[PDB]
Amino acid sequence: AQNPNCNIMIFHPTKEEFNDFDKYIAYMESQGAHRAGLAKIIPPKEWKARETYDNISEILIATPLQQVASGRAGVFTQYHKKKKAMTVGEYRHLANSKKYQTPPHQNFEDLERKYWKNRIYNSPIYGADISGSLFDENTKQWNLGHLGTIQDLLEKECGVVIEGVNTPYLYFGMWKTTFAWHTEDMDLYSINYLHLGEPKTWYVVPPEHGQRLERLARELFPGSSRGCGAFLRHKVALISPTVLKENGIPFNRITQEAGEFMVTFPYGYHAGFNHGFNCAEAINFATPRWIDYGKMASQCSCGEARVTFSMDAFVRILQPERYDLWKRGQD
Ligand SMILES: O=C(O)CNC(=O)C(=O)O
Ligand SMILES: [Mg+2]
Ligand code: NI
Ligand SMILES: [Zn+2]
Helix, strand or coil: CCCCCCCCEEECCCCCCCCCHHHHHHHHHHCCHHHHCEEEECCCCCCCCCCCCCCCCCCEECCCEEEEEEEECCEEEEEEEECCCEEHHHHHHHHCCCCCCCCCCCCHHHHHHHHHHHHHHCCCEEEEEEECCCCCCCCCCCCCCCCCCHHHHHHHHHCCCCCCCCCCEEEEECCCCEEEEECCHHHCEEEEEEEEECCEEEEEECHHHHHHHHHHHHHHCHHHHHHCCCHHHHCCEEECHHHHHHCCCCCEEEEECCCCEEEECCCCEEEEEECCCEEEEEEEECCCCHHHHHHHCCCCCCCCCCCCCCHHHHHHHHCHHHHHHHHHHHC
């Protein structure tokens, strides 16, 4: 078995290897990358996502989200308070302000210590989940707006034609902006490209150990757990590396820098934080190997998780027994 300790793997494809996205994913999996839940892909030196980022300031962040925490430093939830719209240029200035900017630090490890010590005492503002793309239309390799769609993959594998679409999302971050512990919708893959700015630190639980994280989460968030049998689908709970280590939960960590891709694999729980002003682009995707994970994915039916139009068909076809209850949650 390849990668039996489930370490995060880092890949350096050549420009020739960067042509065929599906083939490269399957290569990485042949080497055991999926066992970690997360892999890093450094693009060939010849590649670029676009020519410059000099003209992005007029993108609108219609609903910036202030991430307010509750709990203790290593075990907390966050809720998202909606703020007034602002442009990317306005948000960048805000991220660089004395109130929100990255503190002085020695290295990524020192910054990580500071994040876990102090996150809860601040409420950073995240421009998340903005439909759109920063890839140039002429970028032909690993262009996250030109991937094969999940609907087409389901149709190729299973023969059933379904409605729905699959487009990317932009994320504008600042120091301490936080992504809570989650797997993707329908335990899909994700791919995330850090277009510019400061790093993003990731934490990940190997898919084979995801239920260990879930059991810890039910213990640490006991009211949430009574409310919903899949409350990590709400994407609000944080647990620090120190708490994970104290409870014996297998995990790994890695920092993504500008110009790098990360891939999350089916049922790979992940969480993390931004080091300073940045912009990322991410999208979900599928492969043949996903289908079985899609069929087994948990679902929130309490009403909190509320998701895209396109998840309907995935539930309806892959999980027809759950469909009725899940759809009640959506309506
Ligand atoms: O970058 C973020 O805030 C969150 N991204 C992801 O969870 C991802 O790409 O799957
Ligand atoms: Mg612009
Ligand atoms: Ni994710
Ligand atoms: Zn729920």
